[PDB]
Amino acid sequence: SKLKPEVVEELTRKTYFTEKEVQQWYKGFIKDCPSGQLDAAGFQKIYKQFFPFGDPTKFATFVFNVFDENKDGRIEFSEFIQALSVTSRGTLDEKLRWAFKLYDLDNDGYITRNEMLDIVDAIYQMVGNTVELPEEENTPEKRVDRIFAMMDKNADGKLTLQEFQEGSKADPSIVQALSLYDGL
Ligand SMILES: CC(C)c1c(C(=O)Nc2ccccc2)c(-c2ccccc2)c(-c2ccc(F)cc2)n1CC[C@@H](O)C[C@@H](O)CC(=O)O
Ligand SMILES: CC(C)c1c(C(=O)Nc2ccccc2)c(-c2ccccc2)c(-c2ccc(F)cc2)n1CC[C@@H](O)C[C@@H](O)CC(=O)O
Ligand SMILES: [Ca+2]
Ligand SMILES: [Ca+2]
Ligand SMILES: [Ca+2]
Ligand code: NA
Ligand code: NA
């Protein structure tokens, strides 16, 4: 009940984890999902555990789709560990690029005001009452307006990856959120 040697080596080379950390995360992954394939409902259950005082269902669905690389409706361990690596230990640039993919719902190379608003409304639902909101950003629409004011340099209503990267790095509050390693 362990990973084959070849897979351990492969996954270690593709992530910021060590061999022992990979084998350890697999033990926990298998314990919760014995088949090794996480379903949308199971992934939903996990996110409900991160945010018990809100509704993470909509956001969890968007996240599930992004990191289901091969789009087969299941998150296998290889997809899980690589997602976890970028999201928990990646550099700022690598995290930003996965953040862009999440906001680019149709993967067409632009984030529209409507694509972003859908995600941000999911984020506000997920938080719930667990974050006091300044009045100037107490709605998804207000947050989106501020973001596109800061980042849409050509004012075409869409964000390229270049606009999203430079705009995010300009805001000290965004830089901090994307510069953590194991939550620190
Ligand atoms: C280690 C724990 C905090 C964690 C995370 C996480 O790090 N999230 C985190 C939060 C913030 C920043 C970075 C990471 C994720 C976790 C979940 C989703 C995405 C990323 C990490 C999970 C986890 C839960 C259920 C699963 F099916 C698999 C893993 N788990 C739980 C694993 C644990 O059930 C092992 C099991 O053996 C214990 C038991 O059965 O009693
Ligand atoms: C679960 C965790 C590893 C995660 C994911 C994710 O879904 N990964 C995952 C893992 C395995 C399988 C599938 C998915 C994404 C994550 C990243 C991109 C898109 C969707 C989710 C993030 C995360 C990282 C930086 C951000 F700016 C925001 C969120 N994080 C880290 C969140 C953490 O910074 C929250 C913060 O509020 C707490 C703190 O201050 O430490
Ligand atoms: Ca998959
Ligand atoms: Ca798009
Ligand atoms: Ca633009
Ligand atoms: Na590694
Ligand atoms: Na996408």
Author numbering: 6 to 189
Paper text:
NCS-1 is a high-affinity calcium binding protein that plays diverse roles in the nervous system, including synaptic transmission and plasticity, due to its ability to interact and regulate multiple protein targets. At the molecular level, NCS-1 contains two pairs of EF-hands and a C-terminal dynamic helical region that inserts into a surface exposed hydrophobic groove and acts as a ligand mimic in the absence of a binding partner. Neuronal calcium sensor 1 (NCS-1) interacts with D2R in a Ca2+-dependent manner. Crystallographic and biophysical data revealed that these molecules bind to the both spacious and conformationally adaptable hydrophobic crevice of NCS-1, overlapping with the D2R recognition site and thus competing with D2R for NCS-1 binding.
Crystals were obtained for full-length NCS-1 in complex with ATV and NCS-1ΔH10 in complex with AZS and VLZ (see Experimental Section). The crystal structure of NCS-1 in complex with atorvastatin revealed four independent NCS-1 molecules in the asymmetric unit. The 2Fo–Fc and Fo–Fc electron density maps showed NCS-1:ATV complexes with both 1:1 and 1:2 stoichiometries, where the drug occupied the hydrophobic crevice of the calcium sensor. NCS-1 molecules B and D contained two atorvastatin molecules: the first (ATV1) binds near the entrance of the crevice, while the second (ATV2) is positioned deeper within the cavity. In contrast, NCS-1 molecules F and H contained only one ligand (ATV1), located at the same site as in molecules B and D. Differences among the four NCS-1 molecules are limited to the ligand-binding regions, and within each pair (B/D and F/H), the protein structures are virtually identical, with RMSD values for Cα atoms of 0.151 Å (B vs D) and 0.155 Å (F vs H). Notably, in both cases, ATV1 is buried within the protein interface and shielded from solvent by an adjacent NCS-1 molecule, with F58 acting as a lid. ATV1 engages 10 NCS-1 residues in helices H2, H3, and H5, forming 355 contacts across a 423 Å2 interface. Binding is dominated by van der Waals interactions, with aromatic π–π stacking playing a major role. In contrast, atorvastatin and vilazodone also localize to the upper half of the crevice but extend further into the central region. These small molecules partially overlap with an inserted helix H10, suggesting that the compounds disrupt the dynamics of this critical structural element, thereby hindering its proper insertion into the binding cavity.
